[PDB]
């Protein structure tokens, strides 16, 4: 119903972009409820598609996570990468600003002046976030609106036993800022049993290993594009990249956990 784009392959996922070229539109920093950002959207499509908000971490700008914007937009999503109100905002604040950003992006589907008018299926929303933004992602994933969540090297102080959207945590093995033993790994173990979930730990990864645009793009592409396809688009052509391969046998994946099949 919601399937878009070519039948996938590993090479297709791992290429620098998906099938579509990407246009961008600015959201002013004066927007209420968050710090502005960029809406990324594909050319050469018809009909509606899922929407995604991407949020950075402490003392970090939108550019820290921008890779995810064209990467996913080029695969048939409308993706808004954002700034927070201040660099110092903590995870509870970031969760609130994800919600405000989602509300804003949904409002664009019907705004007269918006380049993505009529292009968003507002029932189909995902969130991606790095570090504290990843804590914020896990918080919003506990609320029952969003349909997919990808925390990237998450940092938070709470626990996540109420997450209720399918959740893929990217962990960075060598992370000194949000060490996996205190953040990503506990967060995954806290996730309840009634969701589809996955833990992908990138081998020798710094805190920045899952932001995108580094040497780990093959794993981030295969897992992250497939996650949003599978869970936002209900697109089971992508199941094969998530459930089936022995993920740890990939030299760039140091640990994998999950509850396949989905």
TrEMBL record:
Superkingdom to which the source organism belongs: Bacteria
Coiled-coil portions: none
Keywords linked to the UniProt accession: Hydrolase, Signal
GO molecular function, one term: carboxylic ester hydrolase activity
Protein name, per record: Cutinase
Provenance organism: Halopseudomonas bauzanensis
InterPro entries registered for this protein in UniProt: AB_hydrolase_fold, FrsA_esterase, PET_hydrolase/cutinase-like
Domain (PET hydrolase/cutinase-like): residue spans on this chain: 1-261
Cysteines joined through disulfide linkages: 172-209, 243-260
Residue ranges crossing the lipid bilayer per the database entry: none
């Amino acid at each position: 119903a919601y399937e878009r784009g070519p039948d996938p392959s590993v090479a297709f996922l791992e290429a620098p972009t998906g099938p579509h070229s990407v246009r961008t539109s600015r959201v002013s920093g004066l927007v209420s409820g968050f710090g502005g950002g960029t809406i990324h959207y594909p050319t050469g499509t018809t009909g509606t598609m899922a929407a995604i908000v991407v949020i950075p971490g402490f003392v970090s700008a939108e550019s820290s996570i921008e890779w995810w914007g064209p990467k996913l937009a080029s695969h048939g999503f409308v993706v808004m990468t954002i700034d927070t109100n201040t660099g110092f905002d903590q995870p509870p604040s970031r969760a609130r600003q994800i919600n405000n950003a989602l509300d804003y992006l949904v409002s664009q589907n019907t705004s007269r002046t918006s380049p993505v008018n009529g292009m968003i299926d507002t029932e189909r929303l995902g969130v991606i976030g790095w570090s504290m933004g990843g804590g914020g992602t896990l918080r919003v994933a506990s609320e029952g609106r969003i349909k997919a969540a990808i925390p990237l090297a998450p940092w938070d102080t709470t626990r996540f036993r109420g997450v209720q959207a399918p959740t893929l945590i990217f962990a960075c093995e060598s992370d000194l800022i949000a060490p996996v033993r205190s953040h990503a790994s506990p967060f995954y173990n806290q996730l309840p049993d009634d969701i589809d979930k996955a833990y992908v730990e990138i081998n020798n990864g710094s805190h920045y290993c899952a932001n995108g645009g580094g040497l780990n793009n093959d794993v981030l592409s295969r897992f992250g594009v497939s996650w949003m396809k599978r869970f936002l688009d209900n697109d089971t052509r992508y199941s094969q990249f998530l459930c089936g391969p022995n993920h740890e046998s990939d030299r760039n994946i140091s640990e994998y956990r999950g509850n396949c099949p989905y």
